[PDB]
Design a protein around this ligand. Structure first.
Ligand SMILES: CCCCCCCCO[C@@H]1O[C@H](CO)[C@@H](O)[C@H](O)[C@H]1O
Ligand SMILES: CCCCCCCCO[C@@H]1O[C@H](CO)[C@@H](O)[C@H](O)[C@H]1O
Ligand SMILES: [Cl-]
Ligand SMILES: [Cl-]
Ligand SMILES: [Cl-]
Ligand SMILES: [Cl-]
Ligand SMILES: [Cl-]
Lengths: 257, 256, 266, 257, 257
């Protein structure tokens, strides 16, 4: 079962994370910005697909989007960069296991979250400058999707955030339990497919959604309050799924007590 | 290497009962995770089912099958405890004298209940998303639960047998390869076959019923409908996993 | 290359097969019964697919069926069970290499064939009992396909059997020439796709087609006499394909020239 | 990067090929016959697909055909059998690197070619015997395709042959540059997808196209001369792509100078 | 983590490239010509797909094209050949790490670029010679796509170039961080899926687009000056994405400070 070995690996990763931040904020933030941008790249692609297929009235739209999102977290895992959603399980487990403090945990969460946002912001501006969202079905897909995410009840967003980060974090969990990089990507592929097509909410992906929506002059269905509204609810949900379910879960499984 | 496989099944059976005797909390938490992991596969393919049924696609059941792999892949990759696979493992470990019938029924009971706890928690949180307040996906849960609860016992029993043959044989494959990619592929193929052919999985049905019982959508379900199905399918699962795969692997491996 | 090493492996597999049989008819038939069952599972899957897409008039039908048949031989290989079709190459090669005898070989063929049949019969009974073949497009796909295979001329069935088992056996051969379990599954997937979609005939798989069809009470248009006819033609087909083509072929490729402890190449 | 290692591998494979022939022509011809038939099996499949989908009026026909051809060269690589096409790169590089003579190379080309043809003749005979090409969309697909290939201008077949064997040989090249069988199969899959769907000409695959079309009693409009014409032009193109592009290219990269 | 190890690897690859160029321009240009031709092979394929599916009015056209482009960078990685785009990250990182100089970097960029073009030119001549772009939906797809690429505003081309090479270079980065060839190909497949389908601009792929369009007598939409316009704007964007984002970024993560 290797639950102790697994918890031992998560504890080390938590430690390595807080060490990296303490050693160099610039390294930690660049890492976070890359992850934020890598996740956003998955959004650019599946929203392009969403625009193309919704316009055709395809029934496969949300299925093809889910199948196509794999790159988001695959890039993060293969580049070894810092993403807020994964850090919910990692810091949580390492903290319960006395590897790191609550303060360390807050630091890592806040810095990776802000760094992820910087990467989303950067990608958004650049994407807008491509003219790819000047007008047409892709722009319209950004605008409609952003508006629907911004107007869902808090409770619904919260609970979707929870299920989303159980899925993200369990695929990160899998990556700590296999030595086959191909098996890692596959599990990531399956988990992102499940969470996208099922309708769960990913805070870091949402940053790029609102980034593009706000920066684009052609899109005007949502405001910054809406963006912040959705981001807060979903982030809170993400934290609950990652730390309360996956982090506590893996702690309980591996703790020699 | 049938002998070596039998030994692996036996050692796994021993670790299972050892875990339970050491910590119920750890055993049940492992079980609740597995029940949740399987349920997640159900959320995915019922979302697909809803979407494609609404559109009248003839591919509906085929896509549902192709998309169920995550269910058991997560269980295997996380090393957690699912009732279905435990039928073969404890059954073979028992015939091979690593564990007793008492241990076997303890494991089955605890993993079954733990799986259910996972299903219930998943159902609650999923209903809370608002994703099945109304529309084709909500309707797919209601209709699918109702057709499953109204099936004759015999039909459910036999579908339970074939389903767990498929689940247990993919577990067996996972014991006969060192490749995790090969493991996931075999699991993918076996789940594809059981979902699309129309076989019945007791743990997955737990999420089907917890979702339906928690959602405000008015089905024709009832708790007695769910229990009826779960009982018939569980017994079918036990026969397929213990009598076929369990006994079968003992016979191939037993250095007599 | 590495044909001699492969030939030794085939030979060893043959020796182990007969050793096992001699040691335990029960162990051997149980292994064969699983394989028949594992192959049949593939049939239950692709026939469900066939039923669904035929009923919808989809042109993709036979393509999707072929793409979805991989589970059949993949389960056999990954479970190390005994399937008649594969045994045709292995026993054949092992014999030519002085490892097993014509006697041992016909025994394995007979025992694995009957064993595969036991697996199909059980699966058919169990499957029919699910109610999934009571009525509808899948029941009909079984009935119609069972009828078309049994009403086909012997020559067509025979040659279809040759090509089927060439593919089945070459995929088994690939599994002897790689250490990667994933490459094994992929190669099996490719070969089973080719053979199902192109329309070749597989004897063990046909055992499940007729078992489900004979055990089913949704009409007939069949006859256990029709099944036997098909099973016989296809089986002889599978035999030459696996033994005359793949078996002899691998022997020739791998037989060290210095032996020559009986025959000379050129 | 390991170009010299690679050229050493090509040269050693070329030496092993001419040694096999000198040692045993029947072994060599049996190996070639297997290769010719393995390739032909790909044609039987994708022509069935071609038949089915052409009859459907589907725009995906040539795409699905391309994706389904991988079995052809995968079988050859995994069985270690002798196929003419790939032999163009291997014997030319090994020759340029002074491991084999010009005479050896032409012996290997002639024998693998005649051997491949023998494999295709056997397959086409057995295939017609199945009654699968007595009538229907598949028989027709065989009949039309054989006729369109035979009536093509020489220059067009020649250049198609070149690009086909660049793709065949580069995927044989990859097979020498990885120790992963899965990676090998994937590259063969991508390259065969590419050459089929783009419309390039493969001499050995054509042998099976013409053995079926000509051996089939259900009529057509090919003729033996038409078959020979296509085979000569495509074979010449295959040689140029494999030897002059891939062979010479890999020699230059890897040559100890 | 292992950023430092990754940076040593890039630096070492940078050193190996400049050494190869100094030792033999021929070996280096031939490697470059191959890569340009390998990338162009992906263009030939996905443009065939584009013609077929556009002609049929399929809404899957752009998605199937992206899914089918993996062969381009897969060949380059697996054959170990020199492509300009990937060189933007490798050289810039190697140079920042003091392994190679600014002069080495501009020399590698210019030679790989020109080498890639030669490969593009050679492929274009030969593809035209196949008769495959004589008339019909595929020739039309080249013509229309080349025109639209040449008539796009500079800023749009530039930013598309940035996002394209971040995707190309990150897949090259992943290839440096795994020992699994299969995982390399998967990551390449994903990144190329993302960049094609999203609409980003690849300078080396574009050389074949204009190669085919210009050499063909039946295509009359673009002109040489148009190709140069596109190639300049896109090459500049590619450089920024590979060197400024990816190169500078992996240095910062990796630099033992
Ligand atoms: C939330 C708590 C769930 C606990 C489930 C316990 C189910 C009890 O189940 C019983 O356990 C006994 C030993 O304890 C065994 O001897 C019996 O075979 C078994 O039926
Ligand atoms: C649908 C077909 C999927 C093929 C995916 C192949 C992924 C290869 O993945 C590799 O498989 C090897 C097994 O040989 C393992 O040893 C390696 O650890 C693993 O990385
Ligand atoms: Cl993530
Ligand atoms: Cl399960
Ligand atoms: Cl088989
Ligand atoms: Cl070939
Ligand atoms: Cl590139």
């Amino acid at each position: 079962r290797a639950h102790k070995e697994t918890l031992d690996k998560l504890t080390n990763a938590a430690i390595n994370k807080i060490n990296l931040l303490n050693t160099s904020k610039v390294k930690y933030l660049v890492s976070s910005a890359f992850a934020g941008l890598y996740v956003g790249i998955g959004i650019l692609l599946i929203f392009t697909i969403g625009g193309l297929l919704t316009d055709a009235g395809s029934p496969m739209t949300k299925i093809v989007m889910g199948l196509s999102f794999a790159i988001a977290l695959s890039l993060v895992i293969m580049t070894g960069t810092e993403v807020f959603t994964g850090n919910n399980m990692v810091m949580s487990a390492g903290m319960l296991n006395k590897g790191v403090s609550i303060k360390d945990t807050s630091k890592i969460w806040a810095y990776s979250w802000v760094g992820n946002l910087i990467g989303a912001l950067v990608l958004g501006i650049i994407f807008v400058g491509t003219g790819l969202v000047d007008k047409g079905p892709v722009a319209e897909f950004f605008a409609n999707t952003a508006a629907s995410k911004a107007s869902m009840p808090f409770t619904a967003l919260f609970f979707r955030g929870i299920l989303c980060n159980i899925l993200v974090c369990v695929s990160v969990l899998c990556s700590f339990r296999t030595n086959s990089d191909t098996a890692k990507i596959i599990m990531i592929f399956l988990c992102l497919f499940a969470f996208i097509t099922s309708g769960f909410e990913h805070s870091v992906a949402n940053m790029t959604i609102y980034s593009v929506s706000l920066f684009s002059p052609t899109i005007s269905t949502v405001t910054i309050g809406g963006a912040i509204y959705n981001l807060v609810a979903v982030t809170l949900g993400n934290i609950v799924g990652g730390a309360l379910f996956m982090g506590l879960g893996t702690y309980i499984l591996g703790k020699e007590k």
